[PDB]
Design an enzyme around this catalytic site. Structure first.
Site, mmCIF file in Angstrom:
data_model
loop_
_atom_site.group_PDB
_atom_site.id
_atom_site.type_symbol
_atom_site.label_atom_id
_atom_site.label_comp_id
_atom_site.label_asym_id
_atom_site.label_seq_id
_atom_site.Cartn_x
_atom_site.Cartn_y
_atom_site.Cartn_z
ATOM 1 N N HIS A 191 37.231 8.470 -15.269
ATOM 2 C CA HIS A 191 36.317 8.677 -14.413
ATOM 3 C C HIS A 191 36.548 8.344 -13.085
ATOM 4 O O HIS A 191 37.541 7.665 -12.942
ATOM 5 C CB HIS A 191 34.959 7.961 -14.937
ATOM 6 N N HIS B 45 34.955 7.238 -9.009
ATOM 7 C CA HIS B 45 33.878 6.634 -8.258
ATOM 8 C C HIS B 45 34.150 7.145 -6.828
ATOM 9 O O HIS B 45 35.459 7.446 -6.413
ATOM 10 C CB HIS B 45 34.245 5.131 -8.139
ATOM 11 N N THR C 38 33.846 -2.519 -13.829
ATOM 12 C CA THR C 38 33.220 -2.451 -12.434
ATOM 13 C C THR C 38 31.570 -1.856 -12.589
ATOM 14 O O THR C 38 30.948 -2.009 -11.440
ATOM 15 C CB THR C 38 33.712 -1.610 -11.112
ATOM 16 N N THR C 39 31.224 -1.635 -14.003
ATOM 17 C CA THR C 39 29.723 -1.265 -13.927
ATOM 18 C C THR C 39 29.308 -2.088 -15.030
ATOM 19 O O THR C 39 30.128 -3.053 -15.926
ATOM 20 C CB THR C 39 29.680 0.402 -14.446
ATOM 21 N N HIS D 85 25.967 7.966 -14.131
ATOM 22 C CA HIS D 85 26.542 6.967 -13.084
ATOM 23 C C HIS D 85 27.734 7.559 -12.641
ATOM 24 O O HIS D 85 28.299 7.243 -11.431
ATOM 25 C CB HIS D 85 26.699 5.825 -13.895
ATOM 26 N N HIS E 193 39.815 5.880 -12.497
ATOM 27 C CA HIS E 193 39.919 4.838 -13.488
ATOM 28 C C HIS E 193 40.190 5.441 -15.120
ATOM 29 O O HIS E 193 39.385 6.247 -15.296
ATOM 30 C CB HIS E 193 38.611 3.909 -13.734
ATOM 31 N N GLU F 62 36.783 1.586 -4.820
ATOM 32 C CA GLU F 62 36.229 0.399 -5.334
ATOM 33 C C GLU F 62 37.108 -0.699 -4.967
ATOM 34 O O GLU F 62 36.711 -1.611 -4.285
ATOM 35 C CB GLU F 62 36.155 0.373 -6.924
HETATM 36 ZN ZN LIG Z 1 35.524 2.746 -13.116
#
Ligand SMILES: [Zn+2]
EC number: 4.2.1.1
Length: 257
Positions: free
Chosen positions: A91, A93, A195-196, A61, A116, A103
Protein backbone atom coordinates in the site's frame (compact mmCIF):
# COMPACT_ATOMS: atom_id res chain seq x y z
CA UNK A 1 -12.58 5.15 14.53
CA UNK A 2 -8.99 6.35 13.98
CA UNK A 3 -8.10 8.29 10.89
CA UNK A 4 -5.98 11.19 9.71
CA UNK A 5 -8.24 14.12 10.57
CA UNK A 6 -7.78 16.66 13.35
CA UNK A 7 -10.29 14.86 15.52
CA UNK A 8 -9.18 11.23 14.96
CA UNK A 9 -5.62 11.60 13.67
CA UNK A 10 -2.15 10.39 14.84
CA UNK A 11 -2.11 12.74 17.83
CA UNK A 12 -5.22 11.01 19.25
CA UNK A 13 -4.24 7.36 18.58
CA UNK A 14 -2.57 6.90 21.99
CA UNK A 15 -5.98 7.01 23.70
CA UNK A 16 -7.08 3.75 22.11
CA UNK A 17 -3.60 2.36 21.38
CA UNK A 18 -1.25 3.17 24.30
CA UNK A 19 1.65 1.54 22.45
CA UNK A 20 1.57 4.71 20.25
CA UNK A 21 4.01 6.17 22.78
CA UNK A 22 6.08 2.98 22.86
CA UNK A 23 9.87 2.60 22.58
CA UNK A 24 9.95 1.12 19.05
CA UNK A 25 7.51 3.29 17.08
CA UNK A 26 7.63 4.11 13.37
CA UNK A 27 8.23 6.03 11.24
CA UNK A 28 11.38 7.89 12.20
CA UNK A 29 13.63 10.47 10.58
CA UNK A 30 16.76 8.88 9.14
CA UNK A 31 19.79 11.04 9.95
CA UNK A 32 22.24 9.92 7.26
CA UNK A 33 25.24 11.13 9.25
CA UNK A 34 24.34 9.25 12.38
CA UNK A 35 23.35 6.02 10.61
CA UNK A 36 26.02 3.38 11.27
CA UNK A 37 27.46 1.67 8.23
CA UNK A 38 27.32 -2.05 9.04
CA UNK A 39 29.55 -4.24 6.83
CA UNK A 40 28.02 -7.46 8.22
CA UNK A 41 24.66 -6.76 6.60
CA UNK A 42 24.08 -9.16 3.72
CA UNK A 43 22.53 -8.02 0.44
CA UNK A 44 18.74 -8.13 0.30
CA UNK A 45 17.28 -10.94 -1.80
CA UNK A 46 13.87 -10.05 -3.26
CA UNK A 47 12.32 -13.01 -5.11
CA UNK A 48 9.11 -11.79 -6.70
CA UNK A 49 9.06 -13.82 -9.93
CA UNK A 50 6.24 -16.16 -8.89
CA UNK A 51 4.16 -13.52 -7.12
CA UNK A 52 0.39 -13.91 -7.39
CA UNK A 53 -1.64 -10.73 -6.80
CA UNK A 54 -5.37 -11.29 -6.08
CA UNK A 55 -7.21 -8.02 -5.63
CA UNK A 56 -7.05 -4.35 -4.70
CA UNK A 57 -9.12 -2.93 -1.84
CA UNK A 58 -9.94 0.54 -0.51
CA UNK A 59 -10.06 0.03 3.27
CA UNK A 60 -10.87 3.62 4.27
CA UNK A 61 -7.26 4.45 5.17
CA UNK A 62 -5.35 3.46 1.99
CA UNK A 63 -5.72 0.87 -0.75
CA UNK A 64 -4.03 -2.51 -0.40
CA UNK A 65 -3.07 -4.81 -3.19
CA UNK A 66 -3.24 -8.35 -1.77
CA UNK A 67 -1.17 -11.33 -2.76
CA UNK A 68 -1.65 -15.04 -2.37
CA UNK A 69 0.62 -15.98 0.58
CA UNK A 70 -0.37 -19.68 0.85
CA UNK A 71 3.13 -20.58 -0.34
CA UNK A 72 6.62 -19.20 -0.76
CA UNK A 73 5.93 -17.44 -4.10
CA UNK A 74 7.03 -13.88 -3.42
CA UNK A 75 9.64 -13.87 -0.66
CA UNK A 76 12.15 -11.51 0.86
CA UNK A 77 15.30 -12.59 2.64
CA UNK A 78 18.89 -11.69 3.35
CA UNK A 79 19.78 -8.23 4.56
CA UNK A 80 19.21 -8.02 8.35
CA UNK A 81 16.67 -10.85 8.20
CA UNK A 82 16.86 -14.39 9.56
CA UNK A 83 14.50 -16.73 7.75
CA UNK A 84 12.08 -16.06 4.92
CA UNK A 85 9.39 -13.42 4.86
CA UNK A 86 6.43 -13.90 2.56
CA UNK A 87 4.77 -10.98 0.71
CA UNK A 88 1.17 -10.46 1.79
CA UNK A 89 0.28 -6.93 0.62
CA UNK A 90 1.51 -3.48 -0.40
CA UNK A 91 0.00 0.00 0.00
CA UNK A 92 0.99 3.68 -0.16
CA UNK A 93 0.85 6.75 2.08
CA UNK A 94 0.68 10.03 0.21
CA UNK A 95 0.21 13.74 0.57
CA UNK A 96 -2.18 16.46 -0.50
CA UNK A 97 0.85 18.26 -1.99
CA UNK A 98 4.11 17.03 -3.60
CA UNK A 99 6.34 18.11 -0.73
CA UNK A 100 4.73 15.76 1.78
CA UNK A 101 3.39 12.24 1.92
CA UNK A 102 6.20 9.94 2.99
CA UNK A 103 6.27 8.63 6.56
CA UNK A 104 10.01 8.18 6.90
CA UNK A 105 12.11 11.25 6.19
CA UNK A 106 15.80 11.40 5.25
CA UNK A 107 17.54 14.28 7.04
CA UNK A 108 14.08 15.75 7.57
CA UNK A 109 13.32 15.55 3.85
CA UNK A 110 9.75 14.39 3.06
CA UNK A 111 8.86 12.68 -0.24
CA UNK A 112 5.55 12.71 -2.16
CA UNK A 113 4.57 9.20 -1.14
CA UNK A 114 5.86 6.06 0.49
CA UNK A 115 5.28 2.47 -0.69
CA UNK A 116 5.10 -0.29 2.00
CA UNK A 117 5.58 -3.96 0.84
CA UNK A 118 4.58 -6.01 3.89
CA UNK A 119 6.12 -9.44 4.48
CA UNK A 120 5.59 -11.93 7.39
CA UNK A 121 8.06 -14.43 8.91
CA UNK A 122 7.05 -17.91 7.70
CA UNK A 123 8.26 -19.57 10.93
CA UNK A 124 5.10 -18.18 12.54
CA UNK A 125 2.61 -19.98 10.30
CA UNK A 126 0.26 -17.13 9.50
CA UNK A 127 0.15 -13.35 9.42
CA UNK A 128 -1.98 -13.06 12.58
CA UNK A 129 0.69 -14.85 14.66
CA UNK A 130 3.64 -12.99 13.11
CA UNK A 131 2.31 -9.57 14.22
CA UNK A 132 2.69 -10.72 17.78
CA UNK A 133 6.41 -11.36 17.44
CA UNK A 134 9.26 -8.81 17.66
CA UNK A 135 10.64 -10.16 14.39
CA UNK A 136 7.31 -11.08 12.84
CA UNK A 137 7.20 -8.59 9.94
CA UNK A 138 9.62 -7.18 7.42
CA UNK A 139 8.47 -4.09 5.61
CA UNK A 140 10.32 -2.73 2.53
CA UNK A 141 9.77 1.05 2.38
CA UNK A 142 10.27 2.84 -0.94
CA UNK A 143 10.09 6.62 -1.37
CA UNK A 144 8.28 8.15 -4.33
CA UNK A 145 9.29 11.51 -5.84
CA UNK A 146 7.49 13.44 -8.62
CA UNK A 147 9.35 13.32 -11.91
CA UNK A 148 8.83 10.94 -14.77
CA UNK A 149 6.09 8.31 -14.94
CA UNK A 150 6.66 4.82 -13.52
CA UNK A 151 5.44 2.40 -16.23
CA UNK A 152 4.89 -0.41 -13.74
CA UNK A 153 2.61 1.75 -11.55
CA UNK A 154 0.05 2.62 -14.25
CA UNK A 155 -1.84 -0.67 -13.95
CA UNK A 156 -2.53 0.27 -10.32
CA UNK A 157 -3.48 3.88 -11.21
CA UNK A 158 -5.99 2.68 -13.81
CA UNK A 159 -8.04 0.55 -11.43
CA UNK A 160 -8.53 3.23 -8.75
CA UNK A 161 -11.85 4.50 -10.17
CA UNK A 162 -13.35 1.09 -9.34
CA UNK A 163 -12.40 1.26 -5.67
CA UNK A 164 -13.03 4.94 -5.09
CA UNK A 165 -14.84 4.48 -1.78
CA UNK A 166 -14.20 2.50 1.39
CA UNK A 167 -15.21 -1.13 1.16
CA UNK A 168 -14.80 -1.37 -2.62
CA UNK A 169 -12.52 -4.08 -3.99
CA UNK A 170 -11.64 -5.29 -7.49
CA UNK A 171 -9.89 -8.33 -8.94
CA UNK A 172 -6.28 -7.43 -9.46
CA UNK A 173 -4.55 -10.47 -10.94
CA UNK A 174 -1.23 -10.80 -12.74
CA UNK A 175 0.34 -7.64 -11.27
CA UNK A 176 4.16 -7.83 -11.01
CA UNK A 177 5.56 -5.99 -7.97
CA UNK A 178 9.04 -6.03 -9.52
CA UNK A 179 8.04 -3.01 -11.59
CA UNK A 180 7.93 -0.86 -8.46
CA UNK A 181 11.54 -1.47 -7.39
CA UNK A 182 14.35 1.10 -7.64
CA UNK A 183 17.56 0.10 -9.46
CA UNK A 184 19.78 -0.19 -6.36
CA UNK A 185 18.83 -2.16 -3.28
CA UNK A 186 20.98 -0.21 -0.75
CA UNK A 187 19.03 0.42 2.45
CA UNK A 188 18.89 1.62 6.01
CA UNK A 189 17.39 -0.75 8.61
CA UNK A 190 16.09 -0.44 12.18
CA UNK A 191 13.56 -2.16 14.54
CA UNK A 192 10.15 -0.49 14.54
CA UNK A 193 6.36 -0.79 14.34
CA UNK A 194 3.32 -0.74 12.06
CA UNK A 195 2.50 2.88 11.25
CA UNK A 196 -1.26 2.55 11.60
CA UNK A 197 -3.17 1.14 14.58
CA UNK A 198 -2.76 -1.37 16.16
CA UNK A 199 0.84 0.00 15.91
CA UNK A 200 2.38 -3.35 16.93
CA UNK A 201 6.12 -3.26 17.46
CA UNK A 202 6.73 -6.29 15.27
CA UNK A 203 8.60 -4.82 12.30
CA UNK A 204 12.11 -4.88 10.95
CA UNK A 205 12.06 -1.86 8.68
CA UNK A 206 14.11 -1.88 5.49
CA UNK A 207 14.00 1.56 3.88
CA UNK A 208 15.56 1.79 0.41
CA UNK A 209 18.02 4.59 -0.24
CA UNK A 210 16.94 5.18 -3.87
CA UNK A 211 13.46 6.63 -4.57
CA UNK A 212 11.46 5.71 -7.65
CA UNK A 213 9.92 8.49 -9.76
CA UNK A 214 6.25 8.66 -10.63
CA UNK A 215 4.47 11.35 -12.60
CA UNK A 216 2.46 14.20 -11.22
CA UNK A 217 -0.62 12.83 -13.06
CA UNK A 218 -0.08 9.38 -11.48
CA UNK A 219 0.09 10.79 -7.89
CA UNK A 220 -2.88 12.95 -8.82
CA UNK A 221 -4.97 9.79 -9.27
CA UNK A 222 -4.20 8.72 -5.68
CA UNK A 223 -5.56 11.98 -4.38
CA UNK A 224 -8.92 11.27 -6.00
CA UNK A 225 -9.73 8.35 -3.70
CA UNK A 226 -12.14 8.68 -0.77
CA UNK A 227 -11.68 7.84 2.91
CA UNK A 228 -15.50 7.58 3.14
CA UNK A 229 -17.86 4.84 2.06
CA UNK A 230 -20.40 5.21 -0.69
CA UNK A 231 -23.37 7.30 0.34
CA UNK A 232 -21.39 9.28 2.88
CA UNK A 233 -19.95 12.83 2.60
CA UNK A 234 -16.86 12.87 0.41
CA UNK A 235 -13.52 13.15 2.22
CA UNK A 236 -10.61 12.89 -0.17
CA UNK A 237 -7.99 10.31 0.80
CA UNK A 238 -4.90 12.55 1.19
CA UNK A 239 -2.23 12.93 3.87
CA UNK A 240 -2.73 9.39 5.22
CA UNK A 241 0.76 9.37 6.75
CA UNK A 242 2.01 9.34 10.34
CA UNK A 243 4.72 11.79 11.43
CA UNK A 244 8.18 10.77 12.60
CA UNK A 245 8.42 9.32 16.11
CA UNK A 246 11.42 9.65 18.42
CA UNK A 247 14.17 7.16 17.85
CA UNK A 248 14.72 6.56 21.57
CA UNK A 249 16.74 3.42 22.38
CA UNK A 250 17.59 2.63 18.69
CA UNK A 251 20.30 2.68 16.06
CA UNK A 252 19.74 2.88 12.31
CA UNK A 253 22.20 0.83 10.36
CA UNK A 254 23.10 1.37 6.71
CA UNK A 255 24.05 -1.26 4.21
CA UNK A 256 26.29 1.22 2.32
CA UNK A 257 29.12 3.60 3.15
ZN1 LIG B 1 2.21 1.63 5.54
Amino acid sequence: HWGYGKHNGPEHWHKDFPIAKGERQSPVDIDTHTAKYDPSLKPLSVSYDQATSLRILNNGHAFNVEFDDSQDKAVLKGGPLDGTYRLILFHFHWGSLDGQGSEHTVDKKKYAAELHLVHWNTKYGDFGKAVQQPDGLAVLGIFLKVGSAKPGLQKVVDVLDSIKTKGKSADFTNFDPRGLLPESLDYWTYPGSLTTPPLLECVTWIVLKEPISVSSEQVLKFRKLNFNGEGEPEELMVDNWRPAQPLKNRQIKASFK
